[PDB]
A paper describes a structure:
αHBs are oligomers of 5 or more α-helical peptides that assemble into coiled-coil structures with central solvent-accessible channels. We targeted two properties of αHBs: oligomeric state, which directly affects the internal diameter of the channel; and the identities of channel-facing residues, which fine tune this dimension and introduce different chemistries. The αHBs are loaded with an environment sensitive dye (in this case, 1,6-diphenyl-1,3,5-hexatriene, DPH) that binds within the channels and fluoresces. Accordingly, challenging the array with analytes leads to differential displacement of the dye across the array to give a fluorescent fingerprint.
Despite the requirements for aliphatic residues at a and d, up to 40% of these can be changed to other side chains without compromising barrel integrity. We introduced mutations at one or two of these sites to generate four groups of αHB: Group I had entirely hydrophobic interiors, but with different sizes and shapes of channel; Groups II and III had polar uncharged or polar charged residues, respectively, at specific points along the channel; and Group IV had aromatic residues installed in their channels. Finally, seven Group IV designs incorporated single Tyr at a or d sites, or Trp residues at a sites. Finally, one third of the designs were crystallized and yielded 12 X-ray crystal structures, all of which were open αHBs with fully accessible channels. Conversely, the FAs generate signal through interactions with the more-hydrophobic and aromatic-containing channels (Group I and IV).
Author numbering:
A (entry chain F), B (entry chain G), C (entry chain A), D (entry chain B), E (entry chain C), G (entry chain E): 1 to 30
F (entry chain D): 1 to 29
Write the structure that this text describes.
């Protein structure tokens, strides 16, 4: 349903946040 | 529905957080 | 309805977090 | 409703996170 | 209700995140 | 109640985020 | 149900954020 689909979109966006945090860690190390 | 729409707005805001984190990564690289 | 409105308030608060992250990036850059 | 009230408490806590992030930006300045 | 109670626990956890971000700000200033 | 249980899992995951932020503060210290 | 499953996906994505923040802590220490 549409509520579950929207919640999956939230989960996808949170994974994008995780990735961006990894890019911060990598950037600091460089 | 309005609940699914509001959840999609939460997903969009989380994407904005990810992009802001990328700006921090880019700042650390400079 | 009140649930959808409250979810929109969460989305707004998340946009505030994105802005504060942009402030961190700017502060690091000088 | 109690669900909408609890969602509002989530939004208030997210604004606290935004403010704490602004404090990190102020620390970086500084 | 149990859903409202769980949502309150999420708000409490978000306040702990704000406090931890305070700790980062204070640690950077030290 | 599976929805309530999953929301409790969200709260637990958020507490893990708070702990990881304390680890960042400890790195600065 | 699918709503509960999507909420569990959100919890998993939050754990990924915690892991990424630990990568930042390790970077700051090094």
């Amino acid at each position: 349903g549409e509520i579950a689909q929207a919640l999956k979109e939230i989960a996808k966006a949170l994974k994008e946040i995780a990735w961006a945090l990894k890019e911060i860690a990598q950037a600091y190390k460089g």
